[PDB]
RNA sequence: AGAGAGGGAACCCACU
């Protein structure tokens, strides 16, 4: 965490820009000092001293600033804030010290470390289980209206945004669809930030794949097993009305968490949802349309296999389906939000101090309490 | 709120009116004794 | 133009005729931006003190009086855009009012307040 | 009247005053340890 | 006609918002991004939000873009209703004043000398100071000797004095303050402030009669009360209907031999019974004393409440006799006979005779 | 918590070797809170870029350059879940990836490859959070842990031959839970590599030792397989509660509720795993000559008869430390705490207790007997209305916790984070077993 | 011989 992930968080935050002559701030290189207390002079704070005086065994965190107003100026080793250190780390004082040296510091060699000293209290970050991200799972909501529901808690590594689960469900209604025409089961997808059950074929058309043959190529990889094609036939025949990418994206934008104004600004919202909300692990870029289409086809194909039983259903308690958030991922998840809040406060300060016509004071821009 | 002060298992009706803290009560560990009758309990001196 | 807009919040005064709100510097340097030709307070501070108000309630940034219902209710539709006062406390002396009436300008009070 | 404290890491002793910031004279160590009491202690050897 | 829309603003900075919007309108009135709104209203006493006059909400949103003080009303706007648009511009409205700012806020100040320059006036005040003793407060008299003793920023001119931020006092502060920094209308000090420098009271349940009109000599009990023309509803004797009477027609009449209290004057706080009801002199005897108290009929009310009118403690001892001999302890409790000893060795406090104890 | 379902709480099959099966809190959090096994290790995760470069180096076809006709006759390959492309020959690709992992050329040891054989898939996981455990590698029904490895491993601190050198030797490797679904795991080599009426004869990995499936608290149980599993769980609960020397520097630490023991002993009946938890260096408990006998009737229903003379000889006689912290607060002059000995005539609201135990600074000198409702910290806070008479600052003092007694062990005086004076008092009370 | 006590809320770990 403190060796790579903090730098990843700092670099993955966009350089904030303010429009008047424009100026942008960027943070590039971070510095992590040794734990030190102070009013007072900088002195190395031994962890037992931090425990006895109810101090916090935290190391200061510096970073370099580069602002371009363009007129660029750099600011090396600006104090961001203090982050706690768990004992026996690579950035604790007593790393690699011999047992005699530890006994000189009133610290025993028997202590395994791995705990933080916060206000003199020893804290342990309990590892938290979670469902494994970026992995397709097929479950059975036997009480709902869906026969088999697929999901993929997609979360791109080193991305400040959290996970966004997409569901690819199949309406059950084993017999009729409560109609005089609705024969087969229809596959329907729950996208992030979209409140209605979007059909699969609508999404595939919205990805720039107009032909039914191409969508079936991306979904069913063999054209010599007519049973799976027959099973996917009703879902394909739900949305033969919508044939254009424009109309498909318009239907995507209809009934969103943020509803569209008109044909305009709703095509862009649907494009934004398909670009940056569903499946971030397959990429977030303009050329990532076909990769996202391939992965959605894989999700639909696995759902079809589950509906056939050719592959068994997935277990929520199998420990190959779980991850263990240790101190690293947990502190990274905390630091994402707190670093973003520090950036927001800096932006507020800059907005206050550009409208007066003056130049902001960057040491007062970065407040250290919000990050420590 | 007042409704939250009354509605709970920690409110006024269960928590304070039904089951309330009482004076003249002691709580300590029990250890066996076969040398006293079935209707006798051996209480400590500091409790008595 | 920007010449009509006051520069700061200190010593804001509203005109007694058209309820024009300006600083004392702008009244001293420009007079009235609507009817100084009928008042002639430019080049005279005492004329400003006699023809402007020290007590006003509410301000209106009248930007387009030609299509404003507020300008219809405040009777400032035929004027120029600027900062106007809703309620004005004060009154011109009888000499100024009589001189305006001799020039065909009857003095309608801008004191549209509901006094009890 | 002054109280004698043992200066933590220094292991030396020094006087202290009321409303006196807690500092050692050798290296300014912040942790003081109060000396053992002067009144008698008696322990039943049970 | 355009409509008014509420836009939330920074508190205390609404006039500056209107000034900035006017400057922005004039600065972009010839460009390709015009402000299509019609007017901006920031009232004198409405604090928190301003008004934008426009035919559309989108015009308001596109006009307030770039204004940070209105960022809390940027996403959504609320229109003032059509019937309520005139309420926006509707405005309602040797003496004594009360200061607006400072530590003397809303304190009674006697206007000593009105300076004809119309900038400030001299005010007589009672100092709310601690005489430079606590700060490194209620109203009390100005003590010049105390401020000469404590020192600091103080200058003496006999009874005249200057102190602690150019505060001018004499014998009682006499300092200049601005007319706009005081309220010269609506103070109305009391009698205690006169020493420092009609009325209607009808209550429900009281008995009143009618002194004039066609409904004269009708005694009834009070139901409700109002300010000046009460339109009372008295429950008269032998009348099931409720009539109407203002305050000038009624009078606090009371039958002889009832609970009476005094509301104001010299006789307030005392209760008792009245004896004989004259034209206006009503004589009564108190619940405390039997002295004659003569009151006006208006200074009476009907209220049925009753009138108010050891040495061994903490001493290290040593058990020198008995089973516990040789134990060192501290005496917790002690009596004439026995004493409880907190044993230093065991986790137990036991009581022994004082004859068995020997102090260290 | 408080869910009536059981599937999130049960001991699933994939908890083998990664998490202890016995240790769990047996309250309303059964199965939810777990304890990690001994050799289990959570993969800290690395970047997938070297793996993608290696795959592009070999004949792996990316998704943006394929026909959708040759997909079903080949194996779909995933990295961290994202589908990176296709490969035609799954064998000699898994062999190549494993050969690189048995050498640490490109792929880190924590990274895991899983070849789904029934359905044509091959997924490589490089996530941070996966839970793996080291296993031996069985090439031929033969182990790769030869005698020379043991010879170089006994002579540590001389050859500098560590565990990481054995990982680099391609003898042991970390297998996670996904990969356990596609591995044939030998329990012990003395039984499952010798020819018999053959069971499978296709082993890939061998368990190092079965005792490493247990946690830290289930490893201190002698003969845990002879017990019943609820008994093992209850002992796992109790073993984190036994008095003992919890740390070596306990005389410096100002811990609250420090339970230490007079004469702790190592168990006569021990496991091999206690040598690695260092339970023989900071033990918790005493070896006792027990007798399982019906007697007078005081060991009736889960109770035990003890020996008074043995207890008088220091048997389980523990010592209980409790610390008390208090600092004063410099504030806006209305209330001002300060450490001083309060006086009856001066202070107000002073509770009736002994204040002569205090020193001149309002604190107890170490080595002074105190009991219930005895003052330990003399602190007085000022009263704003002392002038607004003759009665001044009120007592705000921390007493010794009632129904407790003992000697004050040591007192430390220092400054806090805010720079205010701050005192800790550790009070010592020995606890004879009654 | 001068005699009473207050905090309060929140959240963790166990105990039967
Ligand atoms: Zn004018
Ligand atoms: Zn020293």
Domains of chain D, residue spans: 3-46
Chain F nearest-CA distance from D32, in A, is 5
Element (H, E) at E271: strand E271-277
**Is residue E2 a contact partner of residue E38, using CB atoms and an 8 Å limit?**
yes
Q: Of E167, E163, E44, E161, nearest to E102 (Cα)?
A: E167
Bridge partners for E3 per DSSP? E54
Q: Cα-flanking dihedrals φ and ψ of residue E70, to 5°? A: -105, 15
SS (H, E, C) F170-222: CCEEEEEHHHHCCCCEECCHHHHCCCCCCCCCCCCEECCCHHHHCCCCCCCCC
* Residues in CB range of E93: below 8 A, 6 or more apart: C113, C114, C115, C116
Q: What's the token pair of residue C9?
A: 């919040």
CATH number of the domain residue C80 falls in: 3.30.40.210
Residues constituting chain A: 372
Residues near chain G (nucleic strand), Cβ < 7 A? E 310; F 25-27, 29, 33, 234, 237-238, 240-241, 344, 349, 351-353
3-state secondary structure of E18: helix
**Is residue D33 a contact partner of residue D40, using CB atoms and an 8 Å limit?**
no
Give the angle E267-E271-E275 at the CA atoms, nearest 5°: 95
**Is residue E339 a contact partner of residue E324, using CB atoms and an 8 Å limit?**
no
**Is residue A160 a contact partner of residue A280, using CB atoms and an 8 Å limit?**
no
In angstroms and rounded to an integer, the radius of gyration of the C-alpha atoms of chain E is 38
The residues of F assigned a catalytic role are 302
Under an 8 A CB cutoff, do F371 and E342 touch?
yes
Residue F12 touches chain A, beta carbons under 8 Å = yes
Start-end of H helices in chain A: 5-12, 47-52, 99-104, 200-206, 212-219, 226-238, 245-253, 267-276, 289-308, 327-354, 362-365
User: Rounded to an integer, what distance in angstroms lies between the CA atom of residue E334 and that of residue E349?
Assistant: 13
Residues having C-beta closer than 5 Å to ion ligand 2? D 7, 10, 12, 24, 26
Under an 8 A CB cutoff, do F415 and D30 touch?
yes
Q: Cα-flanking dihedrals φ and ψ of residue D9, to 5°? A: -65, -35
For residue F108, how many other CB atoms are within 10 A of its CB? 17
Ligand nearest to the CA of D27: 2
Q: In Å, what is the separation between the CA of F237 and the C1' of G15? A: 11
3-state secondary structure of A157: coil
3-state secondary structure of E16: helix
Tell me the CATH number for domain A135-323.
Answer: 3.90.1110.10
Nearest CA in chain E to A18: E66
Distance of CA F416 to the CA centre of its chain: 30
Whether chain C lies against chain B with 3 or more Cβ pairs closer than 8 A is no
C-alpha pair distances (Å), E248 with each of E212, E226, E229, E251, F215 = 9, 12, 8, 8, 95
C-alpha pair distances (Å), A316 with each of A322, B18, F6 = 8, 43, 12
Residue nearest to nucleotide G5 (CA to C1'): F351
The position carrying tokens 């491993």 is F153
**How many CA atoms lie less than 13 Å away from A257 in the CB half-sphere?**
8
Q: Of F353, F325, F355, nearest to F422 (Cα)?
A: F325
Nearest CA in chain A to E20: A355
Q: Where are the beta strands (DSSP E) in chain B?
A: none
3-state secondary structure of A245: helix
**Is residue A167 a contact partner of residue A149, using CB atoms and an 8 Å limit?**
yes
Name the DSSP letter for residue E206. Answer: -
Q: Of A39, A10, A42, nearest to A27 (Cα)?
A: A10
Q: What's the token pair of residue F275?
A: 């040598």
Q: Of F122, F422, F428, F396, nearest to F262 (Cα)?
A: F428
Under an 8 A CB cutoff, do E314 and F357 touch?
yes
Which strand G nucleotides have any atom less than 7 A from protein CB atoms?
1-5, 13-16
Instruction: Tell me the chain E residues in contact with residue C71 when contact means C-beta distances shorter than 8 Å.
Output: 39
* Residues in CB range of A334: below 8 A, 6 or more apart: none
Q: Of C7, C70, E207, F36, nearest to A127 (Cα)?
A: F36
**Is residue F260 a contact partner of residue F318, using CB atoms and an 8 Å limit?**
yes
Domain D3-46 fold: Rubrerythrin, domain 2 (2.20.28)
Q: Cα-flanking dihedrals φ and ψ of residue E43, to 5°? A: -65, 170
3-state secondary structure of A270: helix
Residue F406 touches chain E, beta carbons under 8 Å = yes
Chains in touch with A (3+ beta-carbon pairs under 8 Å) read: D, E, F
* Residues in CB range of B46: below 8 A, 6 or more apart: none
C-alpha pair distances (Å), F256 with each of A121, A239, F261, F323 = 10, 68, 16, 5
User: Rounded to an integer, what distance in angstroms lies between the CA atom of residue E151 and that of residue E136?
Assistant: 13
- Which of F114, F128, F213 would best serve as a mutation to test chain A binding (most A beta carbons within 10 A)? F128
* Residues in CB range of E71: below 8 A, 6 or more apart: none
Name the nucleotide nearest F28; use CA and C1': G14
Q: Of F431, E229, F80, nearest to A153 (Cα)?
A: F80
Dihedral, CA atoms, A285, A286, A290, A295, nearest 10 degrees?
Answer: 30
Q: Where are the beta strands (DSSP E) in A71-212?
A: 72-84, 116-118, 121-123, 128-131, 136-139, 146-154, 164-171, 187-190, 198-199
Ligand nearest to the CA of D23: 2
Dihedral, CA atoms, A269, A275, A280, A286, nearest 10 degrees?
Answer: -160
Name the nucleotide nearest F27; use CA and C1': G14
Under an 8 A CB cutoff, do F369 and E330 touch?
yes
User: Buried (b) or exposed (e) across E23-33, using 16+ Cβ within 10 A?
Assistant: ebbbeeeeeee
Residue C106 touches chain E, beta carbons under 8 Å = no
Q: Would you say the C-alpha torsion A105, A107, A108, A113 has a positive or negative sign?
A: negative
**Is residue F213 a contact partner of residue F221, using CB atoms and an 8 Å limit?**
no
Residue D31 touches chain A, beta carbons under 8 Å = yes
Name the nucleotide nearest F351; use CA and C1': G4
Name the nucleotide nearest F237; use CA and C1': G14
Is C62 a domain residue? yes
**How many CA atoms lie less than 13 Å away from A242 in the CB half-sphere?**
23
C-alpha pair distances (Å), A369 with each of A44, A82, A350, B40, E7 = 21, 9, 18, 63, 33
Ligand nearest to the CA of D28: 2
Q: Concatenated DSSP letters for A66-88?
A: EEE---EEEEEEEEEEEEE-BTT
* Residues in CB range of F98: below 8 A, 6 or more apart: F113
- CA–centroid distance, F414 to ligand 2, in Å, is 14
Which residues 314-373 of chain F have a CB within 8 Å of chain E? 354, 356-357, 369, 371
Q: Of D29, D38, D33, D36, nearest to D10 (Cα)?
A: D29
Ligand nearest to the CA of D10: 2
**Is residue A339 a contact partner of residue A371, using CB atoms and an 8 Å limit?**
yes
User: Buried (b) or exposed (e) across E199-227, using 16+ Cβ within 10 A?
Assistant: eeebeeebbbbbeeeeeeebebebeeeee
Instruction: Tell me the chain C residues in contact with residue E41 when contact means C-beta distances shorter than 8 Å.
Output: 58-61, 70
User: Rounded to an integer, what distance in angstroms lies between the CA atom of residue C4 and that of residue C65?
Assistant: 15
C-alpha pair distances (Å), E346 with each of D44, E328, F243, F306, F365 = 7, 10, 21, 21, 20
Q: What's the token pair of residue E226?
A: 């109002």
SS (H, E, C) chain F: CCCCCCCCCCCCHHHCCCECCCCCCCCCCCCCCCCECCCCEECCCCCCHHHHHHHHHCCEEEHHHCCCCCCCCCEEEEECCEEEEEECCCCCCHHHHHHHHCCCCCCCCCCEEEEECCCCEEEEECCCCCEEEEEEEECCCCECCCHHHHHHHHCCCCCCCCHHHHHHCCCEEEEEHHHHCCCCEECCHHHHCCCCCCCCCCCCEECCCHHHHCCCCCCCCCCCCCCCHHHHHHHHHHHCCCCCCCCCCCCCCCCCCEEEECCCCCCCCCCCCHHHHCCCCCCCCCCCCCCCCCCCCCCCCCCCCCCHHHHHCCCCCEEEEEEEEEECCCCCCCCCEEECCCCCCCEECCCCCCCCCECCCCEECCCCEECCCCEEECEEECCCCCCCCCCEEEECCEECCCCCCEEEEEEEEEECCCCCEEEEEEEEEEECCC
Q: Which domain range does residue C55 map to?
A: 1-104
Is C112 a domain residue? no
Give the angle F207-F212-F217 at the CA atoms, nearest 5°: 165
* E64: exposed, middle or buried (Cβ count in 10 Å: 0-12, 13-18, 19+): buried
Residue E68 touches chain A, beta carbons under 8 Å = yes
The position carrying tokens 């403690």 is E313
Q: How far apart are the first and last CA of chain B?
A: 42
Instruction: Tell me the chain D residues in contact with residue A44 when contact means C-beta distances shorter than 8 Å.
Output: none
Q: What's the token pair of residue E314?
A: 């903490």
Q: Cα-flanking dihedrals φ and ψ of residue A65, to 5°? A: -110, 145
Q: Where are the beta strands (DSSP E) in chain C?
A: 12-15, 21-23, 52-53, 55-62, 82-89
Instruction: Please count the structural domains in chain C.
Output: 1
User: Rounded to an integer, what distance in angstroms lies between the CA atom of residue E48 and that of residue E14?
Assistant: 7
Q: Concatenated DSSP letters for E162-202?
A: EETTTEEEE--EEEEEESTTB--SS----HHHHHH------
* Residues in CB range of A57: below 8 A, 6 or more apart: A35, A45, A47, A50, A51, A84, A85, A87, A92, A116, A117, A118
Instruction: Tell me the chain A residues in contact with residue D24 when contact means C-beta distances shorter than 8 Å.
Output: none
The position carrying tokens 């005064």 is C13
C-alpha pair distances (Å), F309 with each of A213, E107, E346, F306, F315 = 91, 83, 17, 9, 9
Is C109 a domain residue? no
Q: In Å, what is the separation between the CA of F395 and the C1' of G6? A: 14
Pairing of strands F347-348, F392-395: parallel
For residue C39, how many other CB atoms are within 10 A of its CB? 24
Chain B nearest-CA distance from F243, in A, is 19
C-alpha pair distances (Å), E262 with each of A5, E1, E204, E252, E300 = 82, 62, 16, 12, 5
User: Rounded to an integer, what distance in angstroms lies between the CA atom of residue E61 and that of residue E41?
Assistant: 16
Q: Would you say the C-alpha torsion D16, D17, D19, D24 has a positive or negative sign?
A: negative
Q: Cα-flanking dihedrals φ and ψ of residue E333, to 5°? A: -125, 150
C-alpha pair distances (Å), E81 with each of E2, E5, E46, E72, E86 = 12, 9, 17, 21, 10
* Residues in CB range of E40: below 8 A, 6 or more apart: C60, C61, C63, E17, E18, E21, E22, E50, E51, E52, E53
Q: What's the token pair of residue C102?
A: 């001799």
Whether chain F lies against chain C with 3 or more Cβ pairs closer than 8 A is no
User: Rounded to an integer, what distance in angstroms lies between the CA atom of residue F63 and that of residue A292?
Assistant: 10
**Is residue F150 a contact partner of residue F163, using CB atoms and an 8 Å limit?**
no
* Residues in CB range of F330: below 8 A, 6 or more apart: F336, F420
* Residues in CB range of A298: below 8 A, 6 or more apart: A136, F76, F83
* C38: exposed, middle or buried (Cβ count in 10 Å: 0-12, 13-18, 19+): middle
Under an 8 A CB cutoff, do B34 and F303 touch?
no
**Is residue F374 a contact partner of residue F349, using CB atoms and an 8 Å limit?**
no
Q: Would you say the C-alpha torsion E212, E215, E221, E224 has a positive or negative sign?
A: negative
Distance of CA F58 to the CA centre of its chain: 43
- Which of F2, F294, F295, F297 would best serve as a mutation to test chain B binding (most B beta carbons within 10 A)? F297
Is C111 a domain residue? no
Under an 8 A CB cutoff, do F300 and B35 touch?
no
- Which of A46, A49, A104 would best serve as a mutation to test chain D binding (most D beta carbons within 10 A)? A49
Packed helices A5-12 and A327-354: angle between N→C axes, nearest 10 degrees: 30
Q: Cα-flanking dihedrals φ and ψ of residue E130, to 5°? A: -105, 15
Residue nearest to nucleotide G3 (CA to C1'): F352
Q: How far apart are the first and last CA of chain C?
A: 38
Chain F nearest-CA distance from E320, in A, is 20
Under an 8 A CB cutoff, do F412 and D21 touch?
no
**Is residue F220 a contact partner of residue F150, using CB atoms and an 8 Å limit?**
no
Q: Would you say the C-alpha torsion A192, A193, A197, A200 has a positive or negative sign?
A: negative
Q: What's the token pair of residue E84?
A: 């309520």
**Is residue C96 a contact partner of residue C86, using CB atoms and an 8 Å limit?**
no
Start-end of H helices in chain E: 14-27, 57-63, 144-150, 191-196
Under an 8 A CB cutoff, do C57 and E44 touch?
yes
For residue A61, how many other CB atoms are within 10 A of its CB? 22
Q: Of F76, F47, F80, nearest to F60 (Cα)?
A: F76
Is residue C51 marked as binding? no
**Is residue F141 a contact partner of residue F193, using CB atoms and an 8 Å limit?**
yes
* Residues in CB range of F224: below 8 A, 6 or more apart: F22, F214, F218, F232
User: Rounded to an integer, what distance in angstroms lies between the CA atom of residue A56 and that of residue A52?
Assistant: 10
Distance of CA F258 to the CA centre of its chain: 19
User: Rounded to an integer, what distance in angstroms lies between the CA atom of residue F353 and that of residue E314?
Assistant: 9
Q: What is the resolution of this structure in A?
A: 3.9
C-alpha pair distances (Å), E319 with each of E263, E343, F199 = 75, 10, 82
Pairing of strands F205-206, F185-186: parallel
Q: What's the token pair of residue A348?
A: 């507020």
- CA–centroid distance, E317 to ligand 2, in Å, is 38
In angstroms and rounded to an integer, the radius of gyration of the C-alpha atoms of chain D is 14
User: Rounded to an integer, what distance in angstroms lies between the CA atom of residue E344 and that of residue F408?
Assistant: 11
């Amino acid at each position: 965490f403190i060796q790579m992930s903090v730098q990843r968080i700092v670099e993955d935050a966009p350089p904030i820009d303010l429009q008047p002559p424009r100026y942008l701030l960027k943070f590039e290189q971070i510095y992590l000092s040794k734990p030190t207390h102070w009013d007072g002079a900088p002195s190395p704070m031994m962890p037992n001293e931090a425990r006895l005086r109810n101090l916090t065994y935290s190391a200061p965190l510096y970073v370099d600033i580069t602002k371009t107003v363009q007129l660029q100026t750099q600011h090396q080793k600006t104090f961001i804030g203090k982050i706690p250190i768990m004992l026996r780390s690579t950035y604790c004082l007593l790393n690699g010290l011999t047992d005699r040296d530890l006994c000189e510091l009133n610290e025993c060699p028997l202590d395994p470390g791995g705990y933080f000293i916060i206000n003199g209290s020893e804290k342990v970050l309990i590892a938290q289980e979670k469902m494994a991200t970026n992995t397709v799972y097929v479950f059975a909501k036997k009480d709902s209206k869906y026969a088999y529901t697929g999901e993929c808690r997609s979360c791109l590594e080193n991305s400040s945004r959290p996970t966004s689960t997409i569901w690819v469900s199949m309406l059950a209604r084993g017999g009729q669809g409560a109609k005089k025409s609705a024969i087969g089961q229809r596959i329907v997808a729950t996208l992030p930030y979209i409140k209605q059950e979007v059909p699969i074929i609508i999404v595939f058309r919205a990805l720039g794949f107009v032909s039914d043959r191409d969508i079936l190529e991306h979904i069913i990889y063999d054209f010599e097993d007519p049973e799976m094609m027959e099973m996917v036939k009703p879902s394909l025949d739900e949305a033969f009305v919508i044939q254009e990418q424009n109309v498909a994206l318009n239907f995507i934008g209809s009934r969103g968490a943020k509803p569209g104004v008109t044909k305009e600004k709703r095509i862009k919202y649907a494009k934004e949802v398909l670009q940056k909300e569903m499946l971030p692990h397959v990429g977030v870029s303009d050329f990532c349309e076909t990769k996202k289409a391939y992965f959605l086809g894989y999700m639909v194909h696995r759902l079809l296999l589950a509906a056939l039983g050719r592959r068994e259903l997935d277990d929520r308690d199998h420990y190959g389906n779980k991850r263990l958030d240790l101190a690293g991922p947990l502190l990274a998840f905390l630091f994402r939000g707190m670093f973003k809040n520090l950036l927001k406060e800096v932006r507020i300060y800059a907005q206050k101090f550009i409208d007066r016509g003056k130049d902001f004071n960057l040491e007062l821009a970065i407040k250290t309490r919000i990050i420590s | 709120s007042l409704k939250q002060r009354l509605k709970g298992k920690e409110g006024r009706v269960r928590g304070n009116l039904m089951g309330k803290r009482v004076d003249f009560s002691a709580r300590t560990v029990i250890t066996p004794d076969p040398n006293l009758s079935i209707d006798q309990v051996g209480v400590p001196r500091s409790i008595a | 133009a920007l010449e009509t807009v006051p520069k700061d919040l200190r010593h804001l005064r509203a005109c007694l005729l058209c309820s024009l709100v300006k600083t004392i510097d702008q009244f001293e340097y420009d007079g009235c931006d609507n009817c100084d030709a009928y008042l002639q307070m430019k080049g005279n501070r005492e004329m400003v003190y006699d023809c402007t108000s020290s007590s006003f309630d509410g301000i209106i940034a009248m930007m387009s009086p030609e299509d404003s219902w507020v300008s219809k209710w405040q009777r400032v539709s035929n004027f120029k855009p600027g900062v106007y006062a809703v309620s004005v406390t004060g009154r011109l002396p009888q000499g100024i009012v009589r001189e305006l009436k001799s020039r065909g300008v009857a003095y309608k009070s801008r004191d549209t307040a509901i006094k009890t | 009247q002054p109280m004698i404290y043992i200066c933590g890491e220094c292991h030396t002793e020094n006087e202290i005053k009321s409303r006196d910031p807690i500092r050692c004279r050798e290296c300014g160590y912040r942790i003081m340890y109060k000396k053992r009491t002067k009144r008698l202690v008696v322990f039943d050897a049970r | 006609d355009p409509n008014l829309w509420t836009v939330k603003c920074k508190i205390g900075e609404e006039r500056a918002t209107a000034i900035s919007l006017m400057r922005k309108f004039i600065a972009y009135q010839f460009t390709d991004t015009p402000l299509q709104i019609k007017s901006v209203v920031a009232p004198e006493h409405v604090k928190g939000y301003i008004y934008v006059e426009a035919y559309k909400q989108t015009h308001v949103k596109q006009a307030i873009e770039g204004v940070g003080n209105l960022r809390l009303g940027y996403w959504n706007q609320q229109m003032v209703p059509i019937k309520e648009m005139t309420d926006v511009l509707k405005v309602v409205k040797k003496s004594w004043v009360r200061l607006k700012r400072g530590i003397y806020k809303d304190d009674i100040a006697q206007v000593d000398y009105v300076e004809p320059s119309q900038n400030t006036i001299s005010l007589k005040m009672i100092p709310r100071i601690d005489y430079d003793r606590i700060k490194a407060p209620p109203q009390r008299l100005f003590d010049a000797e105390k401020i000469r003793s404590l020192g600091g920023d103080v200058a003496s001119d006999g009874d005249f004095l200057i102190f602690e931020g150019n505060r001018y006092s004499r014998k009682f502060l006499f300092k200049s303050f601005a007319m706009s920094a005081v309220i010269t209308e609506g103070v109305k000090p009391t009698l205690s402030e006169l020493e420092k420098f009609r009325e209607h009271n009808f209550q429900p349940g009281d008995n009143v009669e009618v002194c004039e009109g066609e409904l004269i000599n009708l005694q009834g009990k009070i139901l409700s009360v109002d300010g000046n023309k009460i339109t009372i509803m008295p429950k008269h004797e032998d009348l099931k209907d409720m009539l109407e009477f203002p305050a000038q027609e009624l009078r606090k009449y009371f039958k002889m031999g009832d609970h009476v209290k005094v509301i104001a004057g010299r006789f307030e706080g005392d209760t008792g019974l009245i004896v004989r009801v004259e034209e206006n002199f009503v004589i009564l005897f108190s619940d405390l004393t039997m002295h004659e108290l003569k009151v006006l009929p208006r200074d009476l009310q009907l209220c049925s409440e009753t009138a108010s009118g050891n040495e061994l403690i903490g001493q290290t001892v040593r058990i020198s006799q008995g089973p516990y001999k040789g134990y060192i302890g501290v005496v917790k409790d002690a009596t004439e006979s026995t004493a409880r000893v907190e044993l230093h060795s065991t986790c137990q406090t036991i009581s022994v005779d004082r004859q068995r104890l020997t102090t260290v | 918590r408080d869910g009536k379902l059981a599937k999130p709480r049960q001991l699933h099959n994939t908890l083998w070797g990664m998490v202890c099966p016995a240790e769990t809190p047996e309250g309303h959090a059964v199965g939810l809170v777990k304890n990690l096994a001994l050799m289990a290790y959570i993969s800290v995760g690395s970047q997938p870029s070297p793996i993608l470069e290696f795959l592009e180096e070999w004949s792996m076809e990316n998704l943006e350059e394929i026909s959708p006709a040759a997909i079903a006759d080949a194996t779909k390959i995933f990295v961290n879940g994202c589908w990176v492309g296709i490969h035609k020959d799954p064998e000699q690709l898994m062999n190549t990836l494993r050969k690189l992992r048995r050498q640490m050329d490109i792929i880190v040891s924590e990274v895991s490859m899983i070849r789904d054989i029934r359905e044509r898939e091959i997924r490589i996981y490089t996530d941070a959070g996966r839970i793996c455990r080291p296993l031996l590698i069985v090439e031929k029904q033969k182990l790769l842990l030869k005698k020379r490895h043991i010879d170089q491993l006994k002579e540590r601190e001389y050859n500098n031959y560590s565990w990481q050198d054995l990982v680099a030797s391609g003898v042991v490797e970390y297998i996670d839970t996904l990969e356990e679904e596609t591995v044939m795991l030998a329990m012990t080599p003395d039984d499952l590599q010798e020819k018999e009426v053959a069971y499978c004869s296709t082993y890939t990995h061998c368990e190092i030792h079965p005792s490493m499936i247990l946690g830290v608290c289930a490893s201190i149980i002698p003969f845990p397989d002879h017990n019943q599993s609820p008994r093992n769980t209850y002992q796992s609960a109790m073993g984190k509660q036994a008095m003992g020397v919890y740390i070596t520097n306990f005389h410096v630490r100002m811990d609250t509720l420090a339970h230490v023991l007079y004469y702790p002993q190592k168990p006569l009946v021990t496991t091999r795993s206690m040598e690695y938890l260092r339970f023989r260096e900071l033990p918790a408990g005493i070896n006792s000559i027990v007798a399982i006998a019906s007697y007078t009737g005081y060991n009736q229903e889960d109770s035990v008869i003890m020996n008074r003379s043995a207890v008088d000889r220091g048997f389980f006689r523990s010592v209980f430390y409790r610390s008390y912290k208090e600092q004063e607060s410099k504030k806006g002059f209305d209330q001002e705490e300060v450490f001083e000995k309060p006086t009856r005539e001066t202070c107000q609201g002073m509770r009736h207790a002994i204040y002569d135990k205090l020193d001149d600074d309002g604190l107890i000198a170490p080595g002074v007997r105190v009991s219930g409702d005895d003052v330990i910290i003399g602190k007085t806070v000022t009263l704003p209305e002392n002038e607004d008479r003759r009665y001044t600052k009120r007592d705000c003092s921390t007493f010794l916790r009632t129904s407790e007694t003992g000697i004050v062990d040591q007192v430390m005086v220092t400054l806090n984070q805010e720079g205010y004076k701050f005192c800790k008092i550790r009070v010592r009370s020995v606890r004879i077993p009654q």
